[PDB]
Design a protein around this ligand. Structure first.
Ligand SMILES: Cc1cc(C)cc(-c2onc3ccc(C(=O)O)cc23)c1
Length: 234
């Protein structure tokens, strides 16, 4: 992810098949002549899409130009959460499945994994960051405190941002409860709040056509909402 002051990000396509699949996802959802009610509603929850982009002198080098969801914030607090029970897709080999489950074997039980967070601390005027090892170290005993950390600014728990996050996730959940045409593996929610609220879906290299409800995604969203709700009682 490269941030541009124009308020966009350039996301370099991942190696095939992942990068091309992400491109096709955006192209399908944002098809100008698309009138599919499901997909028009989905647009609300994605970064705005500005098309494929490559450097003037390098047509080989493919990027997606996307809305920078963090741009409108002064001190954005950012958390990336992978959603679902499975972070491998329906075409994964035994070996790849094992690779993916190995990365976080609690995915089936918890239904989400914190990929990272960056939290503005008011008292020190500084950011505290967690990397991928943080979320992969969380268990059923520790997930609630693990998520809470995102919303702690050094002096208070930001229950306002927690509640707003629940309200925004609930709309995404409603979208998922009302579509049976796409299943999403290894995709994420990006949470952003002002540390001095956004909740958007990102990372679409493993989105596949389906004829059923995305039950792993729904389980994950519901578990995540339940955790957030519990935090409101702290
Ligand atoms: C600073 C920062 C960190 C992090 C972790 C994410 C983003 C981010 O802001 N707008 C985005 C749109 C799409 C994607 C994406 O990955 O597709 C990422 C975005 C920005």
């Amino acid at each position: 992810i490269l941030q541009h002051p124009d308020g966009t990000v350039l996301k370099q396509l991942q190696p095939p098949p992942r990068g091309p699949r992400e491109l096709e996802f955006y192209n399908m959802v944002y098809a100008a002549d698309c009138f599919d009610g499901v997909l028009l509603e989905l647009r609300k929850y994605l970064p705005k899409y500005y098309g494929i982009w490559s450097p003037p002198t390098a047509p080989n080098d493919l990027y997606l130009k996307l809305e920078d969801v963090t741009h409108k914030f002064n001190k954005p607090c950012i958390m990336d959460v992978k959603i679902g029970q499975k972070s491998y897709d329906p075409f994964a080999s035994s070996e790849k499945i094992q690779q993916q489950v190995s990365k976080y074997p609690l995915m089936e039980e918890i239904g989400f994994l914190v990929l990272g967070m960056r939290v503005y601390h008011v008292h020190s005027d500084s950011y505290e960051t967690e990397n991928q090892h943080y979320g992969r170290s969380l268990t059923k005993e520790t997930i609630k405190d693990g998520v809470s950390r995102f919303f702690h600014n050094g002096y208070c728990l930001r229950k306002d941002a927690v509640a707003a996050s629940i309200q925004k996730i609930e709309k995404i959940l409603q979208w998922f409860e009302n579509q049976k045409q796409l299943n999403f593996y290894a995709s994420s929610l990006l949470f952003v709040y002002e540390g001095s609220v956004e909740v958007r879906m990102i990372d679409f290299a493993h989105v596949f056509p389906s004829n059923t409800i995305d039950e792993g995604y729904v389980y994950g969203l519901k578990h995540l909402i339940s955790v957030l709700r519990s935090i409101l009682d702290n």
